[PDB]
Design a protein around this nucleic acid. Structure first.
Lengths: 58, 262, 59, 128, 59
RNA sequence: GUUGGUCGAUUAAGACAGCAGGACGGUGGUCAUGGAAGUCGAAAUCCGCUAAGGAGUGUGUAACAACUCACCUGCCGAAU
């Protein structure tokens, strides 16, 4: 997903995953922005330890 | 030439010759023709010549500032990292891209034994088998770390071993004995030290063609997406099958750990 | 890394990664400077590779 | 390498393979069989300069108009031009038609580069 | 998550997950309010997807 | 020897010494003929790529060769 990878780069840089930051990255890729999805994902992914999740999965 | 003498071997006039070709072409590439002998050099140059042609230059060559100034680019003393010029070296201009030119020289290299007082560009190694030499100074082999013994009245190499390491100078004795054996350990041609193409300075890491390493990073990046996609509950295009399996894990977990029938 | 992620985004979105249009744009949007020398190497892998094989592989 | 010379179609020649060594450095009449079939091209005529290449227990020359073979043969003149560029001794002036085809075959056997190089040609290692 | 639990549970009974009847209802019993935008996506997912293959596969 | 001069050259567009590298192809379209890309020998002289590499100073394979130096680079930093 374009949205998931857009979040992933922000985490690596140490810049917070919020609606403003994620949305602009999606535009840069050249895939159209659809209104609910960058905001919804940013809200949802917040307060989740992505680091532990990466290292699990069985 | 017919003007054999010291008298003019022109300066400012031949400076202009170098200038015009630089202005014409996108790529100025600097590769070391020092390593190559002249007869050998022509063979490498012949393939490159079809694209756009090469000209070799003296100390007028290092005066790259004036050449750059005439056009607009930035491949001179200042803006390029260092002019890398060596003895009997020219600047090779070619239509072929930075990746392509690397391939062009590398594919067509001509073998030659290594040369005295030059540092060996690669490891030089000796094969097992008869040397082809009659009994003589068997001592000379042993000094170089070419193992030898007399069997059947002849000098023969008992086992392969590495004669000399990279960055170490080639002996006078070493060059002679390698040539007799038929070992030509480096294959010679225009080693590319740096490339300038299209406003960019490209170091040899760009030119190479390893990768395999970069494939691993690709797989790692995708794996981070997949792991995130499991937890989140977000039925976008990739994440829609993955999230379902998270719910399946909860059902599966009780059944496997217990022995409970549902 | 910064560099791996930039073309990774392009592939997932379904866009190609050329130099100026997308590859430079993505990393700059994050606020990190893309290195001109390195970026061409990254771009090169996408060309002439069947990228779906890499997508399938997890590491 | 000691060369050795040949006149078309000869084999085993005593005058050529005895006092100049038996080529291969041993085994006379090894060169003699291979050379005869190879160098039978134009008429046997004046002696052909062939320059020797040596292989693993074989001597053979491949003559396939290598520059050296052509030299005396092309003019077809038994004397010489000697002190040239002023007063040629013979009147054997080879034509342009023969010259271009003779030159071209050399220009694949001598490590030659350019096609356009045959224009540039001649002056010093020819007419002089 | 909140969202995953509701639509998955409906599938076990063989029920579809529409808005009011089942999909919101499971969260409401807990005392949790479902987000309207997120709820819409869960509803959409079950429609037009062959659900049985996803269930069958182990992870 | 040392001194100041004179007339020409070459020189910061990096010359000149000394290392280290290169010193090839058009080419043995040709004459000594047994033979000689320059080379036991002889009248001869320009290109390709050029910044370079003599249609040749020698070392030499009775051939090729690389080697030498004369020609120029890398090193060199001021005169020669």
């Amino acid at each position: 997903v374009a949205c998931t990878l857009a979040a992933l780069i922000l985490h690596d840089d140490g810049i917070p995953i919020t609606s403003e930051k994620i949305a602009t990255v999606v535009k840069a890729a050249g895939i159209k922005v659809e209104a609910y999805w960058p905001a919804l994902f940013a809200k949802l992914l917040e307060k989740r330890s992505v680091d532990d999740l990466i290292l699990s999965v069985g | 030439m017919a003007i054999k003498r010291t008298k003019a071997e022109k300066k400012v006039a031949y400076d202009k010759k170098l200038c015009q070709l630089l202005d014409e072409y996108t790529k100025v590439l600097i590769a070391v023709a020092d390593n190559v002998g002249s007869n050998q050099l022509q063979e490498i140059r012949k393939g490159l010549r079809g694209d756009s042609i090469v000209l070799m230059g003296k100390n007028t060559l290092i005066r790259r500032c004036i050449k750059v100034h005439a056009d607009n680019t930035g491949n001179k003393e200042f803006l390029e990292l260092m002019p890398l010029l060596v003895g009997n070296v020219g600047l090779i201009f070619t239509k072929g891209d930075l990746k392509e030119v690397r391939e062009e020289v590398a594919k067509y290299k001509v073998g030659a034994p290594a040369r005295v007082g030059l540092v060996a560009p690669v490891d030089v190694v000796v094969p097992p088998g008869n040397t082809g030499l009659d009994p003589s100074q068997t001592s000379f082999f042993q000094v170089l770390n070419i193992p030898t013994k007399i069997n059947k009245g002849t000098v023969e190499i008992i086992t392969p071993v590495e004669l000399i390491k990279k960055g170490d100078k080639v002996g006078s004795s070493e060059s002679a004995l390698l040539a007799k054996l038929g070992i030509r350990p480096f294959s010679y041609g225009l080693v590319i030290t740096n490339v300038y193409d299209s406003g960019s300075v490209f170091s040899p890491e760009v030119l190479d063609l390893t990768e395999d390493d970069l494939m691993e990073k690709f797989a790692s990046g995708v794996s981070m997406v997949a792991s995130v996609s499991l937890a989140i509950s977000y039925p976008t295009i990739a994440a829609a099958p993955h999230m379902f399996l998270n719910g399946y894990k909860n059902v599966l977990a009780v059944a496997v750990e217990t022995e409970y029938s549902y | 890394m910064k560099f791996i992620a930039a073309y990774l985004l392009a592939y997932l979105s379904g866009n190609a990664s050329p130099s100026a249009e997308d590859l430079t744009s993505i990393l700059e949007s994050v606020g990190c400077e893309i290195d001109n020398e390195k970026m061409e190497l990254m771009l090169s892998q996408v060309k002439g590779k069947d990228i779906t094989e890499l997508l399938a592989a997890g590491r | 390498d000691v060369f050795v010379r040949v006149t078309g179609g000869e084999v085993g020649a005593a005058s050529s393979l005895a006092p100049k060594i038996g080529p291969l450095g041993l085994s006379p009449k090894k060169i003699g069989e291979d050379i005869a079939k190879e160098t039978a091209k134009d008429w046997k005529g004046l002696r052909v300069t062939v320059k020797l290449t040596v292989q693993n227990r074989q001597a053979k020359v491949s003559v396939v108009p290598s520059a050296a073979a052509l030299v005396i043969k092309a003019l077809k003149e038994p004397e010489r031009d000697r002190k040239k560029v002023k007063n040629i001794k013979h009147s054997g002036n080879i034509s342009l038609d023969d010259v271009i085809e003779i030159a071209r075959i050399m220009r694949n056997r001598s490590m030659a580069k350019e096609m356009a190089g045959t224009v540039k040609e001649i002056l010093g290692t020819c007419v002089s």
